Amino acid sequence: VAAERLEPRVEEKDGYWILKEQFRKGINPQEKVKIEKEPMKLFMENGIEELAKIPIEEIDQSKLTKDDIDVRLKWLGLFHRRKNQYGRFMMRLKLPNGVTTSAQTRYLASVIRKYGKEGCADITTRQNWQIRGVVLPDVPEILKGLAEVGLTSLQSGMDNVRNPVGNPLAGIDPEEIVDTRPYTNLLSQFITGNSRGNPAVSNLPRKWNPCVVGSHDLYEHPHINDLAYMPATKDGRFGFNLLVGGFFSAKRCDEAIPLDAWVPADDVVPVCRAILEAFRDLGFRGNRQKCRMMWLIDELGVEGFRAEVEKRMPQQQLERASPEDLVQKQWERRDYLGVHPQKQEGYSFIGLHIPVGRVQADDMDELARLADEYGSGEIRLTVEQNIIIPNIETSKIEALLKEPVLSTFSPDPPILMKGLVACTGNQFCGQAIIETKARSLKITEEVQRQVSLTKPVRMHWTGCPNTCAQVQVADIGFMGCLTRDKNGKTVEGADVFLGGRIGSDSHLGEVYKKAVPCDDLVPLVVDLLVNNFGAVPR
Numbered sequence: 176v177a178a179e180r181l182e183p184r185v186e187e188k189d190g191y192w193i194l195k196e197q198f199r200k201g202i203n204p205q206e207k208v209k210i211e212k213e214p215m216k217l218f219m220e221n222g223i224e225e226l227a228k229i230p231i232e233e234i235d236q237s238k239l240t241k242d243d244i245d246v247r248l249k250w251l252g253l254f255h256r257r258k259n260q261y262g263r264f265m266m267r268l269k270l271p272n273g274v275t276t277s278a279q280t281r282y283l284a285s286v287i288r289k290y291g292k293e294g295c296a297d298i299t300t301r302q303n304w305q306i307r308g309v310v311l312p313d314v315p316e317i318l319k320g321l322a323e324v325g326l327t328s329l330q331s332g333m334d335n336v337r338n339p340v341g342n343p344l345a346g347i348d349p350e351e352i353v354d355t356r357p358y359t360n361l362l363s364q365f366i367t368g369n370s371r372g373n374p375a376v377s378n379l380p381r382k383w384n385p386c387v388v389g390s391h392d393l394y395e396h397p398h399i400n401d402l403a404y405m406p407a408t409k410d411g412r413f414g415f416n417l418l419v420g421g422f423f424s425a426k427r428c429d430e431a432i433p434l435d436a437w438v439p440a441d442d443v444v445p446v447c448r449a450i451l452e453a454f455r456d457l458g459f460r461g462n463r464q465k466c467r468m469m470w471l472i473d474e475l476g477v478e479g480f481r482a483e484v485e486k487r488m489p490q491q492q493l494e495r496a497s498p499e500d501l502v503q504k505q506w507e508r509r510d511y512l513g514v515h516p517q518k519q520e521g522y523s524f525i526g527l528h529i530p531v532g533r534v535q536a537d538d539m540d541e542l543a544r545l546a547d548e549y550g551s552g553e554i555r556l557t558v559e560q561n562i563i564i565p566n567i568e569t570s571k572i573e574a575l576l577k578e579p580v581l582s583t584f585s586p587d588p589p590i591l592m593k594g595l596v597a598c599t600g601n602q603f604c605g606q607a608i609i610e611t612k613a614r615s616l617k618i619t620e621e622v623q624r625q626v627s628l629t630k631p632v633r634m635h636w637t638g639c640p641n642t643c644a645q646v647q648v649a650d651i652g653f654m655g656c657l658t659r660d661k662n663g664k665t666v667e668g669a670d671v672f673l674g675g676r677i678g679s680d681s682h683l684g685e686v687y688k689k690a691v692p693c694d695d696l697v698p699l700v701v702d703l704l705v706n707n708f709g710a711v712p713r
């Protein structure tokens with residue numbers, strides 16, 4: 176690989192980072208949007224104030240403003256649902272480690288409540304909140320309200336660093352390796368410039384997913400992140416081995432590979448910065464399907480990429496990976512739903528099932544109430560789109576289990592519900608080929624009526640090949656498609672995936688059977704469960 180390939184392609188200009196003039200040939204349309212106007216100006220120069228005053232029908236009449244609402248606003252965590260909920264915006268937070276407060280939860284509930292049938296909220300597969308129904312004129316006030324309660328929505332979509340995932344049991348599990356909260360907090364603060372915006376990392380060639388591991392269970396899914404910090408002692412010092420480049424896409428799914436690098440715990444932010452700078456400076460910016468960081472790693476080779484990270488470290492120092500990490504390969508992933516003792520004597524946490532991650536305003540208020548009455552006002556989100564309420568005096572558990580809302584958000588739902596994950600789908604998402612959330616609940620309910628089982632089978636439903644619900648990690652995955660019934664009529668269907676494994680012995684699942692009409696999935700799944708997962712007909 177020639178030395179010319181290593182010339183940084185972006186430069187700092189007036190506080191923002193822009194593609195150099197000589198590197199603008201052949202770029203994709205999204206890169207052109209970013210050049211035409213810097214998205215971060217909508218927040219950092221308060222461009223949103225005047226934009227929000229323009230009626231949406233007028234906004235749609237010019238490319239600049241249409242691109243503002245459809246593309247640039249994703250830098251402020253705002254996602255126009257143009258096709259399926261025109262004029263309304265989904266809003267996505269930064270929520271490092273999935274940690275929320277009751278006050279924050281009530282604030283979010285109050286926002287969605289205003290929008291009635293157009294409002295609701297969802298827990299995401301990055302243990303994050305999304306709210307729905309937002310209208311553009313309300314955006315300035317919502318941004319202010321979020322800041323007031325200690326939340327940010329910065330840099331949560333498009334070509335940005337996504338929600339930093341950690342251990343949902345951080346600080347409370349007797350069996351944790353290291354509390355991930357300080358690290359995911361530091362990452363989020365770095366990424367967002369302490370909630371002011373950080374232009375140095377907001378002009379990436381593509382999205383980029385980070386996680387910090389603190390569990391033997393690998394709840395954080397390090398194998399499918401762009402950067403995963405694996406806890407490891409090296410020469411008597413605590414730090415992290417680094418895995419890089421994991422990603423899913425329609426075209427290609429790849430597990431993260433070792434960078435062959437270890438950093439002391441205090442170098443978490445420095446190395447995140449170095450890797451992001453290398454990606455920003457050097458990544459391809461053509462075909463959007465070839466812009467994720469792994470494509471750069473393949474182009475330079477992992478050693479070539481490593482050298483680019485190393486030169487961007489303070490004092491240009493980057494140690495080689497530790498021979499061993501702290502994650503024990505002898506491990507059985509633990510159920511976190513239900514009541515579990517914390518490492519703090521006399522305290523428990525409770526994991527509650529949130530059916531397909533969907534809540535209404537009234538539900539959010541009730542969960543916030545529980546957190547205040549029983550816990551410490553904390554609600555934690557999980558990547559299976561469930562919740563944990565920590566820090567509950569164990570003597571209160573008996574009373575808690577009698578709370579009416581636990582009949583809906585149960586500490587012990589049927590086993591297939593415990594493992595069920597589903598993306599937004601076509602209720603709101605314009606890319607979706609099928610409806611996911613309602614369908615997945617219906618099918619799972621019917622399947623569990625027919626068979627009992629003891630193996631914790633994990634079923635993931637995703638609405639299109641973007642695979643936001645990670646079907647490649649599932650025991651049984653369902654990817655939306657259109658197919659045909661016996662009469663040749665168009666019907667919703669799924670491509671069925673098998674082979675996904677998580678934890679230390681991870682593996683990416685692959686298509687097993689294409690184009691199954693959704694109305695025909697129940698018998699197929701019942702038989703798969705009996706034949707491959709020890710299920711017994713009722």
Ligand code: SRM
Pocket residue numbers: 254265267297298299300301302303304305331332337338382384399421422423424425464467597598599603604605606641642643644645
């Ligand atoms: C909400 C969420 C699914 C969920 O129900 O939980 C989601 C929802 C969407 N994803 Fe995703 N993705 C979600 C996690 C993921 C993940 C899973 C993960 O991070 O572990 C992936 C696969 C892993 C990965 O990225 O490597 C994922 C891969 C995509 C892709 C394909 C990326 C690619 O390289 O091709 C797109 C499309 C794109 O970016 O070009 C996408 C695009 C989208 C958009 C923004 C598409 C669009 O604007 O409508 C979806 C918004 C729908 C809506 O209204 O909610 N989403 N998306 C997740 C939000 C996570 C968060 O809080 O930040």
Ligand code: SF4
Pocket residue numbers: 598599600601604605606607608637638639640641642643644
């Ligand atoms: S997998 Fe497809 S349908 Fe589901 S949220 Fe992602 S982009 Fe939308």
Ligand SMILES: [Cl-]
Pocket residue numbers: 249332333
């Ligand atoms: Cl996006």
Ligand SMILES: [Cl-]
Pocket residue numbers: 255256257258259604605606
């Ligand atoms: Cl859309």
Ligand SMILES: [K+]
Pocket residue numbers: 528529530531532559560561595596
């Ligand atoms: K769930």
